[PDB]
Design an enzyme around this catalytic site. Structure first.
Site, PDB file in Angstrom:
ATOM      1  N   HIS A   1       0.740  -1.261   0.000  1.00 21.21           N
ATOM      2  CA  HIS A   1       0.000   0.000   0.000  1.00 21.21           C
ATOM      3  C   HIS A   1       0.775   1.320   0.000  1.00 21.21           C
ATOM      4  CE1 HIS A   1      -3.266  -2.869   0.928  1.00 21.21           C
ATOM      5  NE2 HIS A   1      -4.064  -1.969   0.381  1.00 21.21           N
TER       6      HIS A   1
ATOM      7  N   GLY B   1     -10.446  -3.021  -1.128  1.00 19.10           N
ATOM      8  CA  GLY B   1     -11.310  -1.909  -0.788  1.00 19.10           C
ATOM      9  C   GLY B   1     -11.493  -1.916   0.715  1.00 19.10           C
TER      10      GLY B   1
ATOM     11  N   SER C   1      -5.392  -7.117  -0.911  1.00 16.70           N
ATOM     12  CA  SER C   1      -5.914  -6.187   0.091  1.00 16.70           C
ATOM     13  C   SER C   1      -7.171  -6.748   0.782  1.00 16.70           C
ATOM     14  CB  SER C   1      -6.262  -4.876  -0.568  1.00 16.70           C
ATOM     15  OG  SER C   1      -5.080  -4.138  -0.739  1.00 16.70           O
ATOM     16  N   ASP C   2      -8.257  -5.987   0.732  1.00 11.94           N
ATOM     17  CA  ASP C   2      -9.464  -6.472   1.353  1.00 11.94           C
ATOM     18  C   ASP C   2      -9.737  -7.847   0.726  1.00 11.94           C
ATOM     19  OD1 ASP C   2     -11.227  -5.705   3.404  1.00 11.94           O
ATOM     20  OD2 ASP C   2     -12.850  -5.398   1.953  1.00 11.94           O
TER      21      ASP C   2
END
Lengths: 1023, 1023
Positions: free
Chosen positions: B708, B880, B927-928
């Protein structure tokens, strides 16, 4: 596919030159080439410093390369740096603000007019601290400055003149030389133009075409021992440059070398260098024109030679399927549009149906079309050519039929009756093969019986014919309502608002429809009879003004009015004229405003849709019934697509054709054209940039060996013009602070004629500039740059005068201060003439023969005309056309007076010069300036002092431009002086007394021309 | 001053590389260098063709280099030509659409996702006819394609990852190899990332940091015999490229060479190349922010780190005399303004008087300021830092005094009473060190007695405190008016309009001023008493909605309302929210509209001047009394001036500080920061372009070895983004005509989910495209280019199907068709799953865990949730934050039904999945997406099939940007899974069953992942 190389400079084995607007370097040794600098805009000159390390570059910016400034290039670290923030004004013919040369110490000497009143005053300046300070050499205007044996060599007007081959006028390049550490002597002054001088050893090598073609020559440092070295025949050589050993130059697009010793000429091998993307994208609005409303609420418009059918939105766009050069597009049916396609051969009528696709293009040549229209029933079309003919072309067969041919001008103003039976048009005429004015009478042509009738008499100017819906009466405008308007400055009167509308019923017995004559009291319904219809003519009760169009409606009439205004902006900036759509209700007889800020208007065939352009450049469209409902016509939705090589060829051929078709002498035209075509056409394919094309085109225009062959407008770059911050002042670096060396001012009470600092009640002269907008300027801070970054805004400037005097004001940083400098100069000379003639002589200066000239002449003519003597300084006069008007004034002789009971005498005439007059003129005054000079002598108004003038009296009136907006000019009007013929052209005018203005006169700070003039008048004023 | 060289390619003695966004060529032999191409935009990759003559170049355009396309360069004639018109989407981390390699025949193979539904599908394509046709290799997604002994070598995700050093997740670069003219085998799959593969002889050389740092290695064509060649320690090596003999690459800004034979590493000498103008000019509006109204109708605003005091006009502008980084500007007196200046050390309070000049800047550090304000009597100021403190700074001495510190979030929402006695602010709180929500109670601080009081209770969200002129009552808003709004698609309810205003009189006994309680019937005039004031609270009778501000006036109250709207645009495009200024008259109790289309509003201290920004981006200003009289605030009059090197340093230090200050683990931060600072700071001075800075910054962000760490926004070029004309179709060159190979369509009845051709009732598939807008496309005419030139408009397209079938429609040429392709894919897979499971299995795909994910999940969840089995395909999931919400849904278990008298059963719950579920996941879901995957297993909702996922579960929430608009992100929220810890980070999730998707699977046109899933469910569905 090779490039177009040009304007080289040499240094040892290395050789810099320009290709594709960028700067390149070539090493004879290795034979390799490379681009050393790019993306700065258009570069035309690059000069090697003494050490051969750094390079001074002149780059141009602005859509039309209207601005320029100098940059430095350090080939050691690859550093690039802008040196000047003068934003010098330049044009193709006078690309001022360049490198003049290098002094013995190895410093750069530049030539610029940035701080001068006249562009031609390209005075010499020594660059210091990389653009921090500028020290004047006070040697007067110069293009080149060489050094030899501690002797300054000055080249005046020595830049190349490709646009005028064989030029022999007074502004021809000349060379002077120092002889007594301050004394100068003119050494090279041939009959023709001398360009690009260089010194190898102890000889000055330059170029001239005295033998009929450009060649290289040289002479000792005394202009003696002339020698012809080269013997070219293909293309003139240009841009000579040397390093002390060999000379470098360019010809026909290649780079050549000349060794002074061996006297051998050799071409450098470079081959292909750069071939950019041929398929280019352009913005339609930037080249749009001929916007027209169609049916179904559609729009038609032309751009960059292409045509389109789109909706107001610009979302649904269709291109007409036709090769390059669509001159005009016109509604010809529900889904059919008629167009005018142009080629090297001429203009042809075409038709396209944006619904089906059928696009049968005709072949019958129509010559050079300038107006085209189609009847409302798509049967035929009306066309006007440069042969002064008006004709009807059968939209089915294609057979054009000439109706009538004027012998004075084109018949572009015409209209067709809604029933397709009559054609009313303006017919320009004269009642003598030498009349000073051209009248215009409306003519009406009947398709049945095929006969022409006179709608109007031939005593004035009648125009804008227009029929009413039912086709019962013909409406039109005329400048017949004479009534003088007073001039607020000069005792004079002019016809300002003398325009009025008239009507003519096509049926004898029928009254003026606007007169509202009760039907029960009239007996119309007779029958068409156009005989002696000019007798039944009647005006419509509307106040006189300046009307450009009249549109008859059911119970009202629309009129396009143009409020009176000056013509300065229009004359120099081509600024559009401002009108307003007015409405007249026949019943109420009251007028109202429908739309303002209009600069152009078009109306549908159905009279229901209105299309207009406003002073904001945008195009709008609104229903005539509900004018409040207008939308904006967008066109920049779909990118405009084209090919550089296809357009460049197209543009060359057009430039080549106009040059031929408009040359004043048809004979000379047939020969020059046919002899230069191919030669220059072969260079087009080597061109990759608009600037490359320019070089080719200008050189071909020069082939007419005449004056006024210019090239203006056009898009040469996407770079924004250079900015220059000005406050009408002169700065000088003294220590670590800049001092106001000079504070220009002319007439304090006039507008824009003084340093904006004056408004704060303080003369900045002498003060020290501390800082501008917080940033400290001085030794380590270029004030020129800082001011540049504040141009067009107001900045806080901290100043400091004598004692502890310190000012902190918000000054308006102007984008330019030329005019303020011009007015300053005029007022200085004016004050000078008074003091030296002990208040017995007047002074007046005329900058040009355009609107400004007219302004300046009268600005002082009213205070200086009543002295014992008058000096009409017309030096640097840029020409125009109003010379005749100024002469007419000076022509007046005082023959009486008016004695009042109280007050002073009134001289008769009022515009009469009181006594002896004397004119001053230099080589920088030409065109109308040429005419004025010859006339002044010819009429014996007084003596002429100065130097031979320019010598270009073949006027022009461009009426067509290139698809990129370029406006080329062609010498079309040869001036013939009685008892001298065309002699003035390519020669100029000889002053009764020749008073040179040598470089030493500038060093002494004396004007030998104005002094002689003053001293001469005092002598005549002894009687 | 040397440059930053990078991304080279070699061929013989010649070596091309990138410097200053432009492409250069260097000749080891001669040792010279030259720029071979420029002014195309930002270039990052250049590849030599086989013959070494031509070069394929990837160039980026768009302010943020958000678009890219490929160009050709012919070093023979210097020709340049755009090859692709795909307008591929790219970001710093994934610069897709590049050169994949060259096939044996010497043809260029490119990698792009232009025609794919997911960005990660950077499938391989062979370039034909210079971009005319594109032939797919159907080898699946790839970054590199090499050839050896007739064997295809595929490099997956093999691009460089400077932003994440030591990355060991599932998307790590891997290498496969052909073994049986169609069969492929994975050969290089180390634990870490493998980038930039090359083949010299019979060994593949690549780069990896398995040893803790980037180095070069190689292995035979079987991934065996690993060898470590380089041993660098200064900077990671990048961009390997070869010619078959030696390998080329860049490191720390220099170009190096590695000879496979000698195994010697040598640095190429290049020295200085280009040093552009350091002093740059920018447009204030492009970087403006913090616009605030002052006295005398003045304005204050910040831009590119500078501050200004100007008039609405923008004609009179003053810059605050302070070095770089002014975060905030605030009115602090008649002619005095207070500001917040930031440095590498922190943020400090300052004060400036634009009248006198006195600008005494304080030194007391305030930490990281995010909110600043000044009382109306210029005595003190209120400040909020990232320490979650609210404090008062003595505007005289400079002594900040902390009032209160929240432990949940910053205290940015505060207001000061007009009498400077009270300070009301929102105080974020929690009732537990693990609560799921954070409450906010308004707090009031009294300067006298110095004590805090509770204006509100701590059970919801109370904000926007504001005092009335007389400072008698405190007004504020709260989301306490709970009332559910129904969802029109999914059985759910949400709190949409639950906002309402309240008031609290500071004097006990006094009633609600808006209640209009007759003065004769009340006895106010008590005395300030803030104790238990939250008990006296009262609402104001105004309908519930979504309010953001409340302004109490004399006899009315202004309220800022925000009508309910979707969040898609705001979530992906950062699109501003739309509000409207409302007015409530206390007397009439009626509401009205004062101003609409507002996206932001500010109000003067005197409550008389209003400043706002509308949805058109412009800023306006109008008097509150006469809101009809608004003017436009112009700022682009005065050019914004700065220095590249001063800004670059400033920007680096800030990027370096945020990265340190926001890293989730403070400890690791102190070490990494201190260890990477200087190393990367020494490269800044070599940077000349925003792209140069990016390279340095990203590499330094990578030093945190975490996910990120991105870099978005920022201005990298003045070039407009590339355009791509799309009609949701696939073209194929067949002969001399283009054929519609495919016509994408998803849900015909939805919006934007099919080729615009479908609207004319005809499936284009199979048809032949004749011409577009008149121009004929095909063998000699690039349809991709033509479509590009019509993007965003409607063009006439002539088509041809079977027989004499011919169509001529006006098609909408879209700028993009990704979504249409995505929906097409989803629907295809959906149809597939039905047919194969004989109608017993459902399908749902989740593209990401953002608004779109939420959209797609529910779009099919409502039709697929009631089948025997369900496949929740989450491959390519972009992450997300809404994973938890989707899981909560699937978590539902069907435990009952509703039996109706008429109709079918109703499952309880409604949002319950009927049967067995199964998830599909690949390495392109992170990620999510990572969280969702682990959770799906962890909760046992079903089996997980696919390949290990990305592995980056350290979330971010940027709250500060660079002076050029650049938005950097920092891993600030480390996710901790119970019974696994942070294990997921830098690893990903392991599927219960691993189903690879080899290149041969793509060649056979089979999806082994979706097949297995279907077949597996059928097995479970046998019970």
């Amino acid at each position: 596919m090779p490039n177009l190389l040009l304007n080289p400079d040499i240094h040892g084995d290395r050789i810099i030159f320009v290709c594709c607007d960028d700067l390149w370097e070539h090493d004879l040794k290795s034979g390799s080439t490379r681009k050393i600098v790019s993306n700065l805009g258009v570069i035309n000159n690059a000069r090697f410093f003494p050490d051969g390390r750094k390079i001074a570059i002149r780059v141009m910016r602005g859509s039309s390369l209207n601005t320029a400034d100098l940059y430095f290039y350090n080939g050691e670290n690859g550093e690039i740096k802008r040196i000047t923030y003068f934003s010098g004004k330049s044009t193709g013919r006078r690309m001022f603000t360049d490198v003049a040369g290098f002094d013995p110490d190895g410093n750069l000497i530049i030539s610029t007019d940035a701080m001068q009143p006249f562009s031609s005053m390209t005075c010499l300046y020594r660059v210091e601290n990389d653009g921090i300070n500028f020290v004047p050499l006070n040697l007067g205007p110069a293009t080149h400055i060489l050094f030899a044996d501690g002797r300054r060599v000055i080249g005046r007007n020595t830049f190349e003149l490709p646009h005028w081959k064989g030029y022999r006028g007074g502004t021809r390049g000349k060379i002077w030389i120092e002889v007594n550490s301050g004394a100068f002597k003119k050494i090279v002054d041939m009959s023709t133009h001398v360009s690009s001088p260089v010194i190898v050893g102890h000889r000055i090598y330059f170029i001239t075409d005295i033998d009929g073609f450009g060649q290289i020559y040289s002479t000792d440092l005394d202009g003696k021992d002339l020698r012809k070295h080269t013997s070219f025949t293909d293309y003139y050589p240009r841009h000579l440059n040397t390093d002390g050993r060999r000379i470098l130059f360019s010809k026909g697009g290649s780079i050549y070398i000349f060794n002074p010793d061996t006297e051998k000429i050799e071409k450098i091998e470079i081959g292909d260098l750069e071939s950019p993307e041929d398929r280019i994208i352009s913005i339609p609005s930037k080249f749009a024109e001929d916007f027209s409303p169609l049916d179904g609420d559609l729009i038609a418009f032309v751009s960059r030679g292409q045509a389109f059918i789109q909706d107001v939105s610009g979302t649904y766009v269709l291109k007409v399927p036709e090769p390059l050069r669509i001159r005009y597009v016109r509604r010809g049916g529900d889904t059919k549009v008629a167009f005018i396609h142009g080629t090297r051969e001429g203009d042809f009528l075409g038709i396209y149906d944006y619904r089906t696709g059928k696009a049968e293009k005709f072949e019958e040549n129509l010559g050079n079309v300038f107006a085209m229209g189609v009847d409302r029933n798509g049967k035929f079309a009306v066309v006007a050519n440069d042969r002064f003919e008006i004709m009807t072309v059968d939209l089915e067969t294609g057979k054009p039929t000439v109706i009538e041919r004027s012998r004075e001008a084109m018949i572009t103003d015409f209209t067709i009756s809604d029933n397709s039976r009559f054609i009313a048009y303006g017919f320009p005429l004269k009642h003598g093969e030498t009349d000073g004015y051209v009248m215009q009478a409306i003519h009406v042509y009947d398709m049945e019986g095929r006969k022409i009738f006179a709608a109007t008499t031939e005593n004035s100017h009648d125009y804008a014919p227009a029929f009413d819906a039912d086709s019962k009466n013909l409406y039109y405008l005329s400048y017949r309502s004479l009534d003088p308007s007073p001039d607020r400055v000069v005792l004079n009167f002019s016809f300002e608002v003398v325009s009025k509308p008239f009507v003519i019923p096509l049926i004898p017995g029928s009254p003026n429809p606007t007169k509202l004559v009760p039907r029960s009291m009239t007996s119309e319904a007779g029958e068409y009879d156009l005989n002696d219809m000019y007798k039944r003519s009647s005006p419509i009760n509307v106040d006189p003004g300046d009307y450009r169009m009249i549109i008859p409606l059911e119970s009202s009439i629309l009129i396009y009015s143009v409020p009176v205004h000056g013509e300065f902006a229009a004359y120099y900036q081509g600024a559009p004229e401002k009108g307003v759509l007015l409405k007249y209700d026949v019943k109420t007889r009251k007028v109202t405003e429908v739309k303002n800020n209009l600069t152009d208007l078009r109306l549908s065939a159905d009279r229901k849709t209105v299309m207009v352009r406003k002073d904001d450049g945008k195009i709008y469209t609104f229903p005539l019934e509900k004018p409040e409902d207008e939308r904006t016509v967008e066109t920049d939705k779909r990118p405009l697509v084209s090919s550089i090589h296809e357009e460049f060829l197209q543009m060359y051929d057009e430039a080549w054709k106009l040059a031929r078709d408009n040359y004043w002498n048809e004979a000379v035209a047939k020969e020059i054209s046919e002899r230069i075509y191919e030669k220059y056409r072969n260079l087009v394919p080597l061109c990759k940039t608009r600037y490359d094309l320019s070089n080719v085109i200008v050189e071909m225009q020069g082939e007419y060996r005449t004056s006024h062959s210019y090239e203006m407008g056009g898009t040469f770059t996407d770079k924004d013009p250079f900015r220059s911050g000005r406050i009408a002042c002169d700065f000088k670096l003294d220590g670590d602070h800049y001092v106001v060396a000079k504070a220009y001012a002319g007439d304090y009470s006039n507008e824009g004629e003084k340093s904006p600092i004056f408004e704060y009640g303080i003369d900045p002269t002498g003060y020290l500039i501390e800082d501008i907008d917080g940033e400290t300027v001085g030794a380590g801070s270029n004030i020129y740059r800082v001011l540049s970054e504040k141009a067009g805004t107001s900045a806080r400037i901290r100043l400091s005068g004598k004692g502890g005097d310190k000012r902190d004001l918000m000054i308006d940083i102007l984008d330019d201060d030329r005019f303020i400098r011009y007015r300053s100069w005029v007022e200085a000379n004016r004050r000078y003439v008074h003091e030296r003639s002990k208040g017995t002589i007047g002074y007046i200066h005329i900058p040009d023969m355009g609107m400004m000239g007219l302004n300046e002449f009268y600005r002082l003519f009213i205070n200086e005309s009543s002295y014992q003597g008058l000096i009409v300084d017309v030096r640097f006069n840029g020409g125009g056309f109003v010379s005749q008007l100024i002469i007419e004034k000076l022509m007046n002789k005082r023959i009486g007076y008016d004695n009042p009971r109280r007050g002073t005498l009134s001289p008769y005439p009022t515009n009469s010069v009181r006594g002896k007059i004397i004119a001053i003129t230099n080589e920088y005054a030409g065109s109308d300036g040429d005419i004025f000079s010859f006339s002044f002598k010819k009429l014996g108004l007084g003596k002429l002092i100065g130097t031979r003038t320019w010598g270009g009296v073949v006027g022009i009136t461009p009426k067509r431009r290139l698809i990129d907006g370029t406006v080329l000019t062609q010498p079309e009007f040869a001036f013939w002086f009685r008892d001298a013929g065309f002699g003035v052209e390519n020669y100029g005018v000889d002053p009764d007394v020749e008073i040179e203005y040598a470089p030493h006169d500038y060093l002494s700070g004396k004007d030998p021309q104005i002094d002689y003039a003053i001293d001469a008048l005092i002598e005549e004023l002894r009687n």
